[PDB]
Point group: C3
Chain length 414, copies 3
C-alpha cells in the first residue's frame, strides 16, 4: 500500500542519484583547472637582464675598404658593379669619403667574416654609455655583456652569467632599479641609400627585458626608446605556472632541448631558425648558435636574410613551439619627458665635449624599475582532486540510498 508506493519513490530516489553521480564523474574527466593569481609587493626580487642595441648596426668611421668591398652591397652602399649607386642620397662631405674608399683601383680583397665585422664596426658600449647607475651604485661597461643579435653587437646588463651574483630589488620606484644615459651617435650612422635588412630609417635603440636564462629576440619582441627623451619603464614580474597533461599542454622547463640549457619559447624559436638556415643555406647568421659556417655577405643577401624573414613573417607551420611549464613575463608601462631642458642643454654639451644640438639629437636616458606591486604569480590549480570526487559521489551515495562499496560488492556476489 503506502509502504510500497514510496518504494516507487525509491525508484525515483534511485533515478536522481544516477544523474547527479554521473555528473561529478564526467566533470572529473574534463580535468578542470582554476587560477590562483597573486599580485604582491615582493622582496629579494631578482632583477631581469636588460639587452639593448643601437638601431644602426655598423659605425661609419669603422667601415673599411675591405669591409665596403665584401659587404657594401648588403648595406646598399654599392650596386652590383661594385660602385656607388648613381641614385645615392648625396652628401658633399660624406660622398667624398665613401667614393674614396670605394676606390678599389689598387685593391685586392682580403679575408672577411660578418662576426668580426659586427664585433669591430658595431657600436661600442664604452662610448655609448655616458652614465649608468643601479640602485645608487654606478655601473661601467664592465657590467654589460656583449651579445650578438640580428641588430649586431648588442649589450646585456645583468646577464647574470660570469658567476657574477645577480642583482636584487626590494621596493617600487626608480631608485630601486637601473638608469642609464646613452649617446646613440647619429654622427656614426651609416648613410642609407637604399632599403635592406641591415639599414633603418629610425634613430634610437631597441630594448628587451628578459630572464637571465632566456635569450633575447630583440628584433621581434623588443621595445624602442627615442633619443632626446628620458623614458621611464615601470615593470612587474609575472610568473606563470601551468599544469602538465592531462590538465594542460605543458613542456618541462628543464627541457632536453638543444642549443640552450633551459627550455623557453624564445630559445625554441632560435633553435629552429638555426636548423632552418643551416639546412637551407649551408650557413648560420652571426647571432645563431652551433658550429656552422657564418654566412658571407652574399649568403646574407641571397639566402640567409629571406630565409629568416620567411620564418618570422610568413611561416605558419615549420617553427611553432610548445608552452613551457614556467613562463616569466614582464608587464611594463612606458612614459617620457624631454631631454635636455634649455636650462641644462649647455651643461651636457660642455660636459661631453659636444654641440648643444648634438645633445638634443643623440642623448637619451632610460629608467627601468618596478612598481610597488612588483611581483605577480599566475598559477593554474587543479579543481577536482580524486579524493574530492569520492567524497562527493560517496556523500551522494549515502544520501539517496545509504550504500557503500561493501554493500555493493558483497551483495553483488552473495
Amino acid at each position: 500500500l503506502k509502504r510500497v508506493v514510496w518504494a516507487l519513490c525509491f525508484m525515483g530516489s534511485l533515478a536522481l542519484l544516477a544523474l547527479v553521480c554521473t555528473n561529478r564523474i564526467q566533470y572529473y574527466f574534463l580535468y578542470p583547472h582554476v587560477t590562483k593569481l597573486d599580485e604582491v609587493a615582493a622582496t629579494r626580487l631578482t632583477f631581469p637582464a636588460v639587452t639593448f642595441c643601437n638601431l644602426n648596426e655598423f659605425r661609419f668611421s669603422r667601415v673599411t675598404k675591405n669591409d665596403l668591398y665584401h659587404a657594401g652591397e648588403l648595406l646598399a652602399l654599392l650596386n652590383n658593379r661594385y660602385e656607388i649607386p648613381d641614385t645615392q642620397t648625396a652628401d658633399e662631405k660624406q660622398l667624398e669619403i665613401l667614393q674614396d674608399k670605394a676606390n678599389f683601383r689598387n685593391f685586392k680583397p682580403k679575408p672577411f667574416n660578418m662576426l668580426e665585422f659586427y664585433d669591430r664596426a658595431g657600436h661600442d658600449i664604452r662610448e655609448m654609455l655616458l652614465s649608468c647607475f643601479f640602485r645608487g651604485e654606478q655601473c661601467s661597461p664592465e657590467d654589460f655583456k656583449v651579445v650578438f643579435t640580428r641588430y649586431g653587437k648588442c649589450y646585456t646588463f645583468n646577464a647574470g652569467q660570469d658567476g657574477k651574483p645577480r642583482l636584487i630589488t626590494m621596493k617600487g620606484g626608480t631608485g630601486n632599479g637601473l638608469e642609464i644615459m646613452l649617446d646613440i651617435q647619429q654622427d656614426e650612422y651609416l648613410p642609407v641609400w637604399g632599403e635592406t635588412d641591415e639599414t633603418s630609417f629610425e634613430a634610437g635603440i631597441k630594448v628587451q627585458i628578459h630572464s637571465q636564462d632566456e635569450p633575447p629576440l630583440i628584433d621581434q619582441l623588443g621595445f624602442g626608446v627615442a633619443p632626446g627623451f628620458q623614458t621611464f619603464v615601470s615593470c612587474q614580474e609575472q610568473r606563470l605556472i601551468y599544469l602538465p597533461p592531462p590538465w594542460g599542454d605543458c613542456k618541462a622547463t628543464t627541457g632536453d632541448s638543444e642549443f640552450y640549457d633551459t627550455y623557453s619559447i624564445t630559445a625554441c624559436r632560435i633553435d629552429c631558425e638555426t636548423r632552418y638556415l643551416v639546412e637551407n643555406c649551408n650557413c648560420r647568421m652571426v647571432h645563431m648558435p652551433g658550429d656552422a659556417p657564418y654566412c658571407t655577405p652574399e649568403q646574407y643577401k641571397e639566402c640567409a636574410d629571406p630565409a629568416l624573414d620567411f620564418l618570422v613573417e610568413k611561416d605558419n607551420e615549420y617553427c611553432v613551439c610548445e608552452m613551457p611549464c614556467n613562463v616569466t613575463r614582464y608587464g611594463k608601462e612606458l612614459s617620457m619627458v624631454k631631454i635636455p631642458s634649455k636650462a641644462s642643454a649647455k651643461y651636457l654639451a660642455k660636459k661631453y665635449n659636444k654641440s648643444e644640438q648634438y645633445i638634443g639629437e643623440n642623448i637619451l636616458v632610460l629608467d627601468i624599475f618596478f612598481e610597488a606591486l612588483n611581483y605577480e604569480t599566475i598559477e593554474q590549480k587543479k579543481a577536482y582532486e580524486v579524493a574530492g570526487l569520492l567524497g562527493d559521489i560517496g556523500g551522494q551515495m549515502g544520501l539517496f540510498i545509504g550504500a557503500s562499496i561493501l554493500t555493493v560488492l558483497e551483495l553483488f556476489d552473495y
Copy 2:
C-alpha cells in the same frame, strides 16, 4: 547512564550538523563563481581590425567656396556675418587663398551635405599610405575599408567584411603583424582660427584596435601616434567570458539589439547616441547608422555637437549599457623611436618628392603586433554545482547521524 549521557552527545552531534549543513546551502545560493585565466602562446589567432583617422578632418586644398559657405562657421573660418574673423591667425600666403574663396560676391549657395563633404575633403588613404606590409605581404589602399567616425573619413585595415578572408597570426614579434608608413600631410591641415569640435591643436593620427564585428569609437577609445616617430604597439588578445544570471549580469552577444548584427558595448552606445540625436535634433551625424537626415552644418553647430558632447561627457543615466557575455579586449604596450635618422632623411625626402624638413614633420611608421603570449582567456566558472552541494550535505548527513532521504521521508511518515 553512560549510554544515555552520550545520547546528550547526540544532541550535540545533531547540533553541529545543523550549523555546517546550513552553511554549504546558504553558500550555494550566493551562486559563487571563480576565474579561469590562461595566458598562452596561441596559433591561428585572428588579426583584429585596425581603424585610423587623421586628426585633421578636412583637406585645405579640397575645401571649395560652397564648402566654405555652408560649413565655414563650423570650422571657425567664417564668423556669423559670413566673413573672415578679424581675429584670424594670419598667414600672408594662406590668408590670400581663403579670403579669395570667402568672396561670395558672385556666389549663390548650392546643395550640400556633410557626408559628401567628409567623403570628398577627408584625407585620402591613397595619398597617406606610403607603405603597408602585413606578414611579409604588402598591402594597398584596397586593403583599407572606408569608415566614417566623428573624425570624418577614416580607414579600417582588416575590416574582415567584403567576404575577404580575415588574416591570421602565429608567433610573437613585429614580423607577424602589420607595419604602415604614413604621411599625415600637415600641409593640408586646415587653419585653426578658433576652437570647435572639428578643429584640433594636434598633428598626428588616432588609432583603435577592435574586433572585426565591433564598430569603432575611436574618438573616445582610441590612442594617438605622433609624426616623426616609429611607434611599436605590442598586443595581447584577451577573451573575457562571463556567466549569465543567476551567477552574473550578462547579455547574450547575439543580441537582439538594433543597428548592428552583434551586441557589444560600443555598438550599444552608438545605438543610443543615434536615437538621442534623432529624437532631440531631427538629425543624425554623418557617422551614425539609420535613415534620418544627416545634420546640416548649422544643425551640427547648434544641436548635433552639444547633444553628443553631453552624452559622452555629462550624461550619467541616459545611455548606459549592459555587459555582453563575451568581450574582447586588447592589452597593448607602446614604444617609440625617432624617424628619420640624419642618415636616412635625405633618402626618404628624395624617395617621396618631399623636403627633408617635411619628412620630419609628417612621416610616421606604425607597427602593430602581438607578444609571445598573444592570447588570454578570462572565463568565470561556477564554484558550487548542485551535485557538489548534495555530495557535501549528503556526506555531512552521514557523518553526524548517518541518515538518508529514505530514512527521513519514511520515518517522517511511518
Copy 3:
C-alpha cells in the same frame, strides 16, 4: 571462505580510505585560496586623485638674493666660497642676472626655510594651468590642492579633501575624464650648472594617479609627460582584496599606523622615511609629516638628501612594509600626438601672448580617462571551507566503511 576472503578486501577497503581521507585533511591545512577576477564596465566609479609636478623645482625669477645665499650651493649655483662656479654653463643674459644677485657685498643673511622657499619659488598652478576640463565642466586652480613632494610645490586634482564631493565616472573614453593643458615654463627653469638632487636635465612634468586617501610618492612611482605632445592615459581601476592569516599575510587597511589615517604601502614608506631622517639628521624634509624642524639647505646637502637616497636606493631591510588587505592599482596605457600642428601654432601663440617656438617647447595637453572595462576586482577566495571538508571526509567515510561519529565514539567506548 569467500565471506572472509573479502573481509581481507575490507582491509584493502579500509586501506584506501586512510590515504584518501588523510589527503583532504592535509589539503585543508595548507589553507589554499583561489582568485575571483572580474573585469567589468562599471558605473558611479570614483575618479582618482591626480598629482603633478614640474620637473623644475624653483622659478628663476622668484629666486632672491637671500634664497641664493642660503640655498645656492644646494642648487649648484654657488660653490663653497659663496660665488659663481667658474665652471658655469654661461649665458650672457642669464649670467649677468645671477652674478648681480650673487653679489653679497652689502648683504647680511636673513631667516630662511625650505618650505617657504618651495611654496614661494615653486611653480604656480595659476600660471601653469592654461586650460582644465573634467567631464564637460571646466576646472580652475581652485580645483587643485597644493601638495609638497620631493619635487617641491605640486598640485592634486580631485584630492577629495575639503569636504568637496569626489567626482564620478560612468563610461569609457576621453570625455568622461580629465583634460588639462599646461605651460611648463622652460623660461623659468633654473640654470643647471651641476648635478644635485634638486636639479634635472629634463623638461616636462611628473604625474601620479592614486587614491584620494593614498599619499603620492611621485618621485619614485610617477610617470612623465613630455612638452610639445598631447598624451592620452587610458586607465582601469583594479581593486585587489587579500585574505588575512592564516590564508595570507595581510594588514588591516584601517591600520593603527601613524602619520596618516589609512594604511597603505606608500604611507608606510613615508612614515619610516620620516622617522629615519628625524633620527639620523634631526631634521625633516619639507614634504614629510610630523613636527620636526625642516632641514636647512645645509642639512639637505649634508644629511637629508643622502639619507633618503639611501632609503630609496640601497636600503634592503630598514623600511620594508607589509601588504594591506585592500590595494587599489591603476593600470594605464599611454599614447601621444604632437602639439601644436603647424595649422594651430599661430593661434595658441597669439592666444597666450607667447612665441610660436615657445608654444612648441612648453605646451602640453594631458588626458586622463578610463576604458570601457574600467573596473576590475581581484579578490582571493577560500578554496576549502571546513564544512566542505567534513562533507568530503564524511562522504568518504560512508563510502568504504559506512561509518559515523556515533558509530566510532560509541564503539570506541562500548
